[PDB]
Amino acid sequence: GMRGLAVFISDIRNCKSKEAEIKRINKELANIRSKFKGDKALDGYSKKKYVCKLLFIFLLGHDIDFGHMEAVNLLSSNRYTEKQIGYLFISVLVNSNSELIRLINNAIKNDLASRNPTFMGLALHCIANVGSREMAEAFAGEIPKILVAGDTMDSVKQSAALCLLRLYRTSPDLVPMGDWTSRVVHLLNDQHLGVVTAATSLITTLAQKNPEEFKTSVSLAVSRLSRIVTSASTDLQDYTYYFVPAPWLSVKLLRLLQCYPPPEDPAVRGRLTECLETILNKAQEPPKSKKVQHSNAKNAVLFEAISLIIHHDSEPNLLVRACNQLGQFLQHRETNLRYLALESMCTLASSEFSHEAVKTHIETVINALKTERDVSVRQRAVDLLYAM
Amino acid sequence: XXXXXXXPQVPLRPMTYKAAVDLSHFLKEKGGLEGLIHSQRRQDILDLWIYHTQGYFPDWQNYTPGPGVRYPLTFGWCYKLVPVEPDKVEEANKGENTSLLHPVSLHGMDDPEREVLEWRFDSRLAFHHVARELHPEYF
Amino acid sequence: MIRFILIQNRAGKTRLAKWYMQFDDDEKQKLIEEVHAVVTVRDAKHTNFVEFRNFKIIYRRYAGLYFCICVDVNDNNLAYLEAIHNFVEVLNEYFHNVCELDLVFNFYKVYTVVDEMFLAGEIRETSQTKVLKQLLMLQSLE
């Protein structure tokens, strides 16, 4: 690694007072400024090392008045470490300065053009992190092409999907629905779950403004969701978290489903309901692991599924089961779960069909009101009472 | 300590008062457990070793709910979990070199009542089944 | 979405900060201070979530460090709670027995890690295997 950087950090730690820290820092700033406006052209390592030191100083809370140019020079470097530090730097310290912006944008352009996936991910992330309007203007057109193209690497695909999301959030106008939309939906079918995870976020946000374009996703997601929950540990070894299969992708697909009403094709609607029934069953099954990570992963999916059930207000039997599980959670020893159950049930109360089922637990709630130490939970319980 | 020693092969055996009492002492003699910070992973490691070597199915080691001292359900198990005082937890977590995932650093995430707990040995537990007295419901 | 990720020690020094939304420095500083106030005072007794008018905080404490993810109110509380651990565990594997000091000396590397796991105010990669593999690959590179 870079020894000189390590030493400068140790020196800062070793400082006994705020003042000593300032003195050491100003010394470094001057030493560095000396090198940059220095006769010697700097080797790749030192330029990378010094720019790193400047960043540390910035993070320390001291403003930095220079070093932006050097960072751009590092962007050109073909060495990854040099390129990563530079891109980090312009990401943290963003300039309104136009001269810099044109230089940066050219640097990014070169990287996206380069077939190396690592450079592409640096460039892609940079756009996402900065997410500037100026930056959007430059690449809003280009990014979907990268995302949608086959032959694009998975990792590039992941960042590509999320990067476009940033562009769409920042500058919705520059991102119009087009033909990339169809291909993006089928990205939900990708073998690599990391891609699917990223794609689903893009889709969920897009579907909110323009639902009609992406209803095809509904059918696709329901199929993957069902497959994932029934999935065995050996089949998804990489994405199984404490014996829970893809908890986060499952959550995300359920939230996507919440954008739409129940699926138009009954076959799909059946597959979905059986899936939700399964999820609810798994809750009551004896736990594979005693560890809390298992429960949190498992329950996070459940609470999202319950959220979908409540949203649709579609299936009575499910609404009934949902009410039941939440009621069981009111008694749970973990403060976290009781809080969440009280919240969800509170929403559930609004459903006309389920209203009477919720009123069953009024005593349980009141009992909590007498014994509950947590102030936040007490509010979510008082809130439930008014709901009934 | 024995946690280092631990860190199917044998036939199944029932958990009995004699089994639990002998087991308690067997662990004490091998050094360890007393004073040790509780984490679910640790107990899982412990439960398994007892299970593989000595054939006791890992269901026996359960404790009363918190907060406060957690008492063993199995009679003749002489180890109770007691909460560490807050000031003691903080002093232990002082410093920038303490591991993020060390049991003291977890701050009782494994515990529903979120209390940091340590094993302590009690002679009395062999003679008095404190768990039954406190929570007959469980019995 | 995730409005911002915060890694803060008990003292109040900021080990990491990722902003997925626009904030001016006056706002950020108010936020950093505001977040520190809530978590240090808040105990075990309390839930892992803290509720803001506009935002929600999911936070967990490891050693001297508070890991805080700030999200919109509709976002999944439990999911992000465990996302934090998934993140810590990746960090653990990466630095080999990770500690706060590691986060200071290798600060430029922690950004790399966060970006693999979170991007654009969203969850990116949730597989420890793949994040770690990628992280290893990059080490080899010059």
Numbering used by the authors:
A (entry chain B): 9 to 396
B (entry chain C): 55 to 61, 72 to 203
C (entry chain D): 1 to 142
What does the paper say about this structure?
At the cellular level, Nef has been ascribed multiple functions, of which the best characterized and most critical for pathogenesis is the downregulation of CD4 from the surface of infected cells. Myristoylation allows recruitment of Nef from the cytosol to the inner leaflet of the plasma membrane while the loop engages the clathrin-associated adaptor protein 2 (AP-2) complex. AP-2 is a heterotetramer composed of α, β2, μ2 and σ2 subunits. Nef has been shown to bind to the α–σ2 ‘hemicomplex’.
To elucidate the structural basis for this interaction, we have solved the crystal structure at 2.9 Å resolution of Nef (residues 54–203) in complex with the α (residues 1–396) and σ2 (full-length) subunits of AP-2. The asymmetric unit contains four Nef:α–σ2 complexes, all in similar conformations, with small variations in the quality of the electron density. Nef buries 1170 Å2 in this interface, of which two-thirds is buried against σ2 and the remainder against α. In contrast to most other crystal structures, the central loop from residues 149–179 was visualized in its entirety. The central loop contains two additional helices, one from residues 150–157 (H4), and the other a single turn from 167–170 (H5). The Leu164-Leu165 pair of the dileucine motif anchors the loop in a pocket on σ2 just as seen for a dileucine peptide bound to the unlatched AP-2 tetramer. Nef Glu160 of the motif binds to basic residues on both σ2 and α. The whole turn-rich section of the loop from 171–179 is anchored internally by a hydrogen bond between Nef Asp174 and the main-chain amide of Gln104, and by a partially buried salt bridge between Nef Asp175 of the loop and Nef Arg134 of the core β sheet. In particular, Gln104, Arg105, and Asp108 bind to a basic patch on α. The present structure revealed that Nef Glu177 is the primary interaction partner for α Arg341.
